[PDB]
Amino acid sequence: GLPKKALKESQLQFLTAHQTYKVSFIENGVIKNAFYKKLDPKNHYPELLAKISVAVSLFKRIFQGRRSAEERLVFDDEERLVGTLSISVDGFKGFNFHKESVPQESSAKEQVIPSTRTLIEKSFMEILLGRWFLDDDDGHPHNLSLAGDIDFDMFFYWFTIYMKEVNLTVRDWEGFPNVKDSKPFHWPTYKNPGQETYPDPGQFEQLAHEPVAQEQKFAAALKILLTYQPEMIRKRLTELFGEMTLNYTSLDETDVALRNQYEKTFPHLCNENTNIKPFVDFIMNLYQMHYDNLYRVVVFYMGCENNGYGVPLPATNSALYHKPSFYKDIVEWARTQNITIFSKDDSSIKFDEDELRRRYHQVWRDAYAPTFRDLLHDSYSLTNKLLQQVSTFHVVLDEVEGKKPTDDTLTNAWELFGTMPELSLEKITPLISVDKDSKLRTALILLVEFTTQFHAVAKTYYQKDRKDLTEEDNLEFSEQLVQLYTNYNLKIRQSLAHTSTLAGEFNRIAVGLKQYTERANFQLHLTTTDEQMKEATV
Ligand SMILES: Nc1ncnc2c1ncn2[C@@H]1O[C@H](COP(=O)(O)OP(=O)(O)O)[C@@H](O)[C@H]1O
Ligand SMILES: [Mg+2]
What is the rounded distance in angstroms from the CA atom of residue 121 to the CA atom of residue 105? Predict the structure, then answer.
């Protein structure tokens, strides 16, 4: 029939008597006020645009909670879509236009036109990041509030712009909220809409300068990454859509030329074959694009000395290690939301703490992939210089580089690691000359065994996927690197003692190996406190 969490226009008590009406209705034995929008296929907001706006409302509520209005699908009495709903956000006072009045109580206009310091007290960075995460184009004052956001009819700008009139880059993650590569039309930092109108836009521009605002931005990005439990989000979306198919053919009701625009511009997403498949599978496959994109930017971020606006940003491997409270807060916020807005929901669509832990374990592991690729690449490069000085034919081995951190085809972290296909003890022993042992001949054989074992241990631990990622796997990884360091660190740097730049090059590889063999210990990281980690570095 019609979805479980869908309503019917006949079930709505209008409080008045786009086409926005004020509405109330009954839910779980209590009334819930809301705002009603009616489908207008001939004035934008078609069926599949309205159908995407309700999925966005759910996606956002998973990591924002009550700060993102939940939307519903409303049908007529004959099971035909007619509009969408948007349950009122408790404590929504919206933002002012420069043409509207300026309240005379300073405590009431700090809610309508907020001061940059009051935005940090009310955690508005979490909201602005969510809009940027899903490429929102309508970040104009009335769609934003000091306690949440409500309007989603202009989300997924890269795929939805055609019914009105993804590339999240590291450069935007650095100087956020001053987005510039990702170009919205309305944004709080903008002074003039279309810059790449708020009465005081500079109040939002300063959030990129304040360091406390950047910590809230990181805590927001980590919430988006860790709350993502797809196994439930698929179940919860079917509560709002059921077996509804994608059905992009409904664009014919608006104009057949638009359907032709979509099947020609996006052939891999909305075609004859996908048009009959569930709308859930379509937008989930569409959401994972944004997730993998935000995952590449944040989890692999390696730091910055100065944003374009004043604050230095740490590498996420250091931010997670130095501040273990980030994860401890997401776990507390999850249990809170489990007994808050999910109290009446079933156990099978609640935050699973165990799954949330493995997710953080992944983000922990993958957040270190760069500094372990770097050590393996530095360890590779030094094995070549030794193979040049010891081999008869001055053999230099080629290194297949791994995919860059911003390549849009990158999903898991193990693809960041380069490989040396011919680096094997069985393949290098015959290449050595019995005429060039300055102790460099014994160093090559050692540094080959070292780099092989190193890469082998990284592989076994980085190929474990999230569903098979045991906290013991991180112990195995750490217990071997510490065994690797203790077995080769002395013998190798004793065999390079007589060299100059060649020895110092292995000093940095060993020093880094020791440091990040301990910083990466996950079981030990979960027992730390922000203050314990602030005094352990001095
Ligand atoms: N859940 C909600 N809570 C509070 N106000 C809302 C909600 N949904 C809509 N509104 C009101 O409706 C207006 C936005 O309606 P909508 O049609 O969704 O966006 P737009 O009008 O920009 O297309 C805002 O001015 C807002 O005050
Ligand atoms: Mg709108």
Answer: 19
